[PDB]
Design a protein around this ligand. Structure first.
Ligand SMILES: Nc1ncnc2c1ncn2[C@@H]1O[C@H](COP(=O)(O)OP(=O)(O)O)[C@@H](O)[C@H]1O
Ligand SMILES: Nc1ncnc2c1ncn2[C@@H]1O[C@H](COP(=O)(O)OP(=O)(O)O)[C@@H](O)[C@H]1O
Lengths: 243, 50, 148, 200, 150, 39, 88
């Protein structure tokens, strides 16, 4: 069965690796190697498996549906700041002060490796998104790794990492997330809608009818309520003039 | 009391007093008796239901 | 949200849950404001509080024991691990509740560990037939299948 | 007190009803007539039955003729509806064998209490660290991957050290004989750190 | 499976220390019409062990509703409620618990949404006595009084 | 407390003819394939 | 799965340029055979898959996968481990 998995790697970049550092409950350094043929993840409930899943989706989308598996379409309790803060549910914060959290993934297509990255850090004790400092990395270079990026950050600020990218072949970095996401989409020749659908799949859960399947899971709405609002306002001006 | 609950509880209470043969005992249908007594006591303004 | 906050009583309050030390007022737990988003702890907490409330409602005033002991439950166990599921069953029994657990053919082992009987159901097209068994008869039938 | 307020609001209802009476001419005539009639009505003895069901000389308008009794409109009961349905009270029992093999395999799942007991006993007698491969050789698992997971689970539960980069392998035949080769993390299961922990 | 004339049955049973209680129901259609009001119901409540859905269905096929209520009157430890509210009132009397108990039981029976705790309470746990319609009535009365003033 | 051990069920759902459950008062589960008649 | 595979394939490509798909709580509300059919459909679409489970359906995953990642938590700290198997 799993032989078609290698055919997928020939047709596509398949992701099998992870590098983590202080993400959520995963304190210190941790890493994972994954089989090309497919893989599983296990552990006692409330141990960090969905935390790892969310770790993966943080690198891939501007905003994911954090812990969407638990909610079933409802708002996530967690977010980037909580994971980098090591929230545990109200000491409950593992990283209250100036800290760092690194996450990365690796892929391969026809033996050619590609690694994504994200160096996070609070330079403050406050946990606002503004205080949430970040840098994003896209790599076609196998020799660039999350451990290397962590070391370079330890040497100095983002300027050392961007300078490292300039010195390093097949590497790109972006202190602005949307540039990194655009680079990733351009590499894979597909719009961000595919990644949004992927994230929906990451927490795929219940529904009520066949119609709901399409409407919610499959499609993107782009309803025209803003158009109706502006139309109503312009028509109100027209009504003023007519009166 | 919701009227259905009240009448059921009343039909239960009246059954206890079938042992009190010295006053009316319903021979065949206690529920009808309870409903009739609730009607009657509404008629006497003892109980008003809304 | 504002309309409910005004005219609906319960929305005027935020509900919080905590874990208490048996011997003392000591407390380290709080499920309120920030739920924590635990993928297993929230499930056990919700099932536990729901069971307690349901027992209190089921128990006629005065009595600590529900009069209608039966309860129905579902794949909350599937979301739960083995240990937390066992905690769920223990809590359910301790509150005076007899229960019935439904699952689509999985997590058998802990059920066998903490339940006595089972019922099997069939799907043979547009039909379904079901029989009641004890765990041991099912085990013997499994052995018969394993032999041949 | 809310009940009283309901009565007060109710009364204000009729006050509001009587405020708006700037009637047109014809409306005004009929309003005079209706108020006179209603005043006259109050003095009747409504509670009596016979008062209520007395006829009034109001003329018939909106009159409808109906129910013209043409004999040709008659139709009769037709008994083709007698199609009977059998009362199948028989017991539609089950057939255990038809159940899929997956059901039995789940019914064969790894038992954690027995596995914990056996692993603790084996490690107590072995009185030394025992890697996963050594445990597999010392104890042939039934659900091989299930026991691997549970063994790493006890290891982490006891805080036993694990190194994932350095590796080691163990081969096992499955339920249908097909052999497999595992890649496993190096570690040593120590009995003392394990018995001290409770399991469920 | 049964689009045309049919009869349906349900009968649960519980016991406490060797005493039976049996909740029953019957739902039959005289034709293919399947509207909600077309459904002819007859609830049943009995603690007599001899009573069973099999027996009720046998009596139904033998006769019909006219025979069924006659069976209840002739029988002991049995009751029949041609409507549901009366049936549930009796059942709540026997189990001495309010309707909120059963409703919360049903809400919990399929709880899979299973979201944050605050929603568990407001949705399932607590009976509902909101005050929207009453505020609307207060506003209506105030507007009427303002109309008088104007 | 009363404990539910029976379901006599006829021409209901995907259950043609008569059926019967024997839940056990000691703690019970009911199990069947996806789309088998549990719910 | 169909929509995600189709979206992930660049214009005119019968197979994706990104074949990985994540599934947390992979089969929490399904039977063993249904999950097997799900994996079969994934095979039809040629997607690399990742399943997460709190120790359910180990039979199916063992029959259908070739590696596992272990998750455990002591207090506020969590750690992972890598495991794999292959057929000889
Ligand atoms: N980032 C976090 N935010 C809030 N709570 C967390 C976080 N990380 C861990 N926790 C706690 O640590 C555990 C993480 O396990 P998790 O993977 O999220 O649950 P599950 O395995 O059921 O999906 C949970 O018990 C949770 O309480
Ligand atoms: N609306 C319906 N949709 C699907 N099946 C239905 C429906 N109504 C009745 N059924 C019948 O009754 C059963 C209902 O599905 P069921 O198996 O009880 O759900 P679950 O898998 O959660 O236990 C089905 O097996 C089918 O035979």
């Amino acid at each position: 069965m799993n032989q078609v998995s290698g055919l997928a790697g020939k047709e596509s970049f398949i992701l099998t690796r992870i590098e983590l550092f202080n993400w959520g409950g995963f304190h210190g350094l941790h890493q994972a190697a994954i089989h090309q043929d497919g893989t599983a993840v296990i552990g006692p409930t409330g141990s960090g498996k969905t935390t790892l899943v969310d770790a993966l989706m943080t690198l891939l989308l501007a905003n994911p549906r954090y812990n969407l598996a638990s909610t079933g379409g409802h708002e996530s309790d967690r977010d980037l700041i909580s994971y980098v803060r090591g929230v545990s549910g109200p000491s409950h914060i593992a990283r209250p002060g100036k800290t760092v959290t690194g996450i990365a993934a690796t892929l391969e297509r026809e033996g050619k490796q590609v690694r994504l990255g994200a160096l996070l850090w609070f330079d403050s004790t406050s946990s606002s998104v503004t205080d949430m400092k970040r840098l994003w990395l896209f790599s076609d270079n196998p020799g660039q790794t999350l451990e290397h990026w962590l070391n370079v950050y330890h040497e100095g600020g983002t300027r050392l990492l961007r300078q490292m990218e300039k010195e390093a072949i097949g590497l790109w970095t972006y202190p602005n997330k949307k540039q990194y996401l655009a680079r990733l989409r351009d590499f894979f020749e597909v719009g961000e809608n595919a990644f949004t659908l992927l994230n929906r799949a990451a927490g795929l859960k219940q529904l009520n009818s066949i119609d709901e399947i399409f409407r919610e899971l499959v499609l993107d709405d782009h309803s025209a309520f803003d158009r109706a609002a502006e139309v109503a306002n312009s028509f109100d001006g027209l009504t003023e003039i007519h009166q | 009391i919701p009227l259905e609950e009240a009448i059921q509880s009343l039909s239960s209470i009246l059954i206890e007093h079938v042992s009190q043969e010295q006053y009316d005992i319903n021979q065949d249908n206690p529920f009808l008796q309870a409903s009739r007594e609730l009607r009657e006591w509404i008629k006497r303004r003892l109980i008003v239901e809304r | 949200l504002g309309a409910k906050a005004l005219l609906d009583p319960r929305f005027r309050l935020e509900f919080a849950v905590s874990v208490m030390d048996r011997q003392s007022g000591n407390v380290i737990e709080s499920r309120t404001g920030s739920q924590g988003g635990s993928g297993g702890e929230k499930e056990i907490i919700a099932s536990y509080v729901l069971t307690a409330s349901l027992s209190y409602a089921l128990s006629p005033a005065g009595s600590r024991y529900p009069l209608f002991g039966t309860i129905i439950l579902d794949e909350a166990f599937s979301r739960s691990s083995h240990a937390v599921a066992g905690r769920i069953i223990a809590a359910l029994r301790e509150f005076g509740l007899h229960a019935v657990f439904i699952t689509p053919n999985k997590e058998m082992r802990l059920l066998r560990d903490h339940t006595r009987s089972a019922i099997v159901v069939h799907r043979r097209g547009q039909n379904s037939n079901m029989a009641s068994l004890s765990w041991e008869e099912l085990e013997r039938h499994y052995q018969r299948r394993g032999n041949a | 007190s809310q009940t009283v307020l309901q009565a007060r609001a109710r009364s204000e209802r009729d006050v509001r009803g009587f405020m708006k009476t700037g009637l047109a001419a014809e409306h005004h005539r009929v309003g005079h007539l209706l108020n006179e009639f209603l005043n006259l009505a109050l003095k009747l003895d409504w509670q009596r039955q016979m008062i209520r069901k007395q006829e009034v000389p109001l003329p018939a308008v909106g009159v409808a003729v109906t129910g013209i009794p043409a004999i040709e409109r008659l139709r009769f009961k037709e008994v083709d509806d007698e199609a009977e349905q059998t009362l199948d009270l028989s017991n539609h029992a089950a057939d255990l064998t038809q159940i899929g093999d997956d059901f039995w395999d789940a019914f064969n799942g790894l038992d954690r209490e027995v596995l914990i007991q056996q692993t603790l006993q084996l490690l107590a007698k072995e009185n030394r660290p025992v890697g996963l491969a050594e445990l597999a050789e010392l104890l042939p698992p039934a659900h091989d991957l299930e026991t691997f997971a549970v063994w790493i689970g006890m290891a982490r539960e006891a805080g036993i050290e694990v190194i994932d980069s350095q590796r080691e392998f163990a081969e096992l035949s499955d339920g249908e004989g097909r052999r497999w080769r595992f890649n496993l993390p190096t570690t040593g299961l120590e009995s003392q750190a394990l018995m001290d922990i409770d399991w469920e």
